[PDB]
Design a protein around this ligand. Structure first.
Ligand SMILES: NC(=O)c1ccc[n+]([C@@H]2O[C@H](COP(=O)([O-])OP(=O)(O)OC[C@H]3O[C@@H](n4cnc5c(N)ncnc54)[C@H](OP(=O)(O)O)[C@@H]3O)[C@@H](O)[C@H]2O)c1
Ligand SMILES: NC(=O)c1ccc[n+]([C@@H]2O[C@H](COP(=O)([O-])OP(=O)(O)OC[C@H]3O[C@@H](n4cnc5c(N)ncnc54)[C@H](OP(=O)(O)O)[C@@H]3O)[C@@H](O)[C@H]2O)c1
Ligand SMILES: [Ca+2]
Ligand SMILES: [Ca+2]
Lengths: 416, 416
């Protein structure tokens, strides 16, 4: 019905032309609080960003936060069963740059993921997750400092599309019949009481993702792009991802064979560095990141694999309490921590706000406000090195001081 | 045509009745050499097993090895394009207990996996992979000793079924048309130039796997069974796996709520221990194994997830050079390392034979030859503690002696 969103009177809208953002001194930034621990981490992110912006520009610049709604809080604002109001999608696109806390997705039934809904409806086809080591962060591995990677996760297709039917349903039986009788499929071991999902992977979806990964490698003078896939078992989806990725590198970036292949080199047109384009089968890759972390840099992979890789890598540098991300499309960008709503901690002021804070760091950098972004990095490193940290770091360390979520936010500010 | 397999004159066939193996003193055991590094690890496994058997039983018992064929070597024995002769399947079933080196599966085209073909054709629906720490093994993690888990990976369905069509093929277009027009599917982002795979998960496939996992937990007095799944995003496949797994625990093993759930406890009828039945979402699980390894024990998961988990966990305890496995069905069992053919090392006598050797350890234990199995464990621990090890361990250690694959086999024997 009537919108409950309040456009800030003091703010102005970020604009986009020529693919370049025009960010005013007083930009309006929509944010979603998030379900569960969103109630803890979001207020910490708001105060930390505001402090970094104030310290960097001395009042010349200020973000006008505009709360928008999705998830539990939306049902309370807009009414029962309003989980994702249309205006939320419209406002994120209109305002160009936004940030969200995590959203709860029920298992085995219930609503489809609102996080996926946002990514899909806004065509935010890049899930960008940098994973790097902050000095002083406790880690289960001996050399966390060797992990410095950037995940480019395809964000619009794969088994994530949400195409599936429940076992014993008329639809599942309908699909199973089609597959067996019309497609001559014989490899369904138990066609009765059988759930069915569909996994699509397209040339266009692949290439736009890999193109972004390669451009990022060029823009940031990175060393390599590794295509991760399970293309021996899934030849026509994951295997195609690998083939299209290599093809894209050759056709658009001049990739050439390294010593007869199969890897390619792409010459960085800005620095002259030869960027290696390579690939690793996904299961083997989960060992490679632990046993040979220094050999990997930019990672390009499909939706599901990227999901797994995000948590696995984050764990090497302290866990998903320190794992930022962004969902990026051609028209807008929605910043977002890797982690979920961790309901068991929700409202305890306990979890690590580092992830959403570092997602705001990416947002600020995205906005060209690099000085403010630098202060967040500085404050984060300062607080961790001072061993004043949240429970997830404290349990992996001797002699640390346990801080609440809110207190760790203050610690970051104190270290700016 | 004419079989090229030679049945050993001195051996006798293992038999099965009442689900119990009757293993003669002179059992015939089929083995497949394997492609690639199979040429290195298989001869080491043969000599190590023979030594353990000789030392344990002083000539009273002896394995009559019978080479059978699949993969590259089969094409050379039986002719071009004979990759998996029917007799190989027949002989594994007939002889009840067999062991294989790894087999090469091409990426993005070429033959479908022979490893999967064997598992599927023989209905070896359990992929059983124990992951534990051998003292003295180098590791990227600080506390590898906290990892002591057993993977039960569903081995007959999931996206592994091999049901998929190539982008732009008549069949893919046919399936895409069916999905869009007859099933009203709207979530395929790019329906053109689009590969398509099918992911089936059934009640029966799930329950037989989880039943085995729970029985193993009972038989070995383990602490918990964790169901790993991505059931928030794949509600009707992975989410169903989780639901059926819990249901099975309740209906067949008397599982009861722990403090109002969602976890269950299953009382061990032999020891009285309460076995915890729980679940973790798959991405989060890849952090859990690193940050809270001691909280996990028996793992039950679907085909693909188990594939990933096998390598990720193995890496915590030295990598897939020390990662054994078994494919187990109701009628026979085929032992097999977790690792592949690593073609870049093939024939260099370089890789770690530990994995296939420890798979033979499982085979021996499976045969009730526990004394021989114990000697393999002892020799393995002895060689590693002596820091005489293959390249994969040597690079993670200071002051080790680098051994060839064959030499490490001798080192194991020397330490029996
Ligand atoms: N993009 C998103 O909004 C998003 C992402 C992932 C999951 N989810 C949703 O969240 C719900 C719960 O999923 P889940 O429990 O598997 O994942 P989760 O909410 O990320 O929690 C998994 C574990 O990760 C650790 N963790 C998560 N956030 C943390 C933080 N801020 N600081 C420190 N540690 C943190 C905790 O580990 P320990 O308890 O071991 O210390 C937590 O129990 C699901 O409905 C899922 O759909 C949403
Ligand atoms: N069940 C099977 O038969 C099986 C299983 C997996 C893969 N494969 C097949 O094998 C082929 C190659 O796949 P891939 O290269 O991704 O996997 P891979 O053959 O397992 O090799 C991956 C990496 O794992 C390490 N590794 C593997 N075996 C080892 C050993 N015995 N000792 C020490 N380290 C070892 C090596 O790591 P580093 O080089 O980093 O030291 C190797 O490069 C594919 O065709 C695949 O289909 C078969
Ligand atoms: Ca995730
Ligand atoms: Ca594997």
């Amino acid at each position: 019905m009537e919108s409950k969103v309040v456009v800030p009177a003091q703010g102005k809208k970020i604009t986009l032309q020529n693919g370049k953002l025009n960010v005013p001194e007083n930009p309006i930034i929509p944010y979603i609080e998030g379900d569960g621990i969103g109630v803890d981490v979001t207020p910490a992110m708001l105060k930390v960003v505001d402090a970094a912006v104030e310290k960097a520009y001395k009042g010349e610049r200020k973000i006008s936060w505009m709360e928008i709604y999705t998830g539990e809080k939306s049902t309370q604002v807009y009414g029962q069963d309003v989980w994702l109001p249309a205006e939320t999608l419209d406002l994120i696109r209109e305002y160009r740059v936004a940030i969200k806390g995590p959203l709860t997705t029920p298992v085995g039934g219930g609503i489809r993921s609102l996080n996926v809904a946002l990514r899909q409806e806004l065509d935010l086809y890049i899930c960008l997750r940098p994973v790097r080591y902050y000095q002083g962060t406790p880690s289960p591995v001996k050399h966390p400092e060797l992990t410095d990677m950037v995940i480019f996760r395809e964000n619009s297709e794969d088994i994530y599309a949400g195409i599936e039917w429940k076992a014993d349903s008329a639809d599942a039986e309908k699909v199973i019949k089609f597959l067996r009788e019309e497609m001559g499929v014989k490899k369904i071991r138990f066609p009765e009481h059988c759930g069915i999902g569909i996994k699509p992977c397209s040339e266009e979806g692949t290439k736009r993702l890999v193109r972004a990964a390669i451009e990022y490698a060029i823009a940031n003078d990175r060393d390599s792009v590794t295509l991760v896939h399970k293309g021996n078992i899934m030849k026509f989806t994951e295997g195609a991802f690998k083939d299209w990725g290599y093809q894209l590198a050759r056709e658009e970036f001049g990739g050439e064979l390294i010593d007869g292949g199969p890897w390619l080199k792409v010459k960085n047109p800005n620095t002259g560095k030869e960027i290696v384009i390579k690939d690793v089968i996904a299961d083997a890759f989960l060992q490679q990141i632990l046993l040979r972390p220094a050999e990997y840099d930019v990672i390009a992979c499909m939706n599901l694999n990227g999901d797994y890789i995000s948590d696995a890598l984050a764990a090497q540098v302290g866990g998903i309490g320190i794992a930022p991300g962004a969902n990026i499309g051609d028209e807008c960008a929605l910043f977002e921590a890797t982690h979920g709503t961790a309901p068991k901690y929700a409202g305890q002021d306990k979890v690590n706000p580092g992830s959403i804070i570092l997602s705001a760091e990416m947002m600020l950098r995205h906005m060209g406000w690099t000085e403010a972004a630098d202060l967040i990095v500085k404050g984060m490193e300062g607080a961790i090195n001072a061993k004043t940290v949240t429970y997830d770091f404290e349990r992996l360390m001797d002699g640390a001081k346990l801080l609440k979520c809110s207190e760790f936010g203050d610690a970051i500010i104190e270290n700016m």
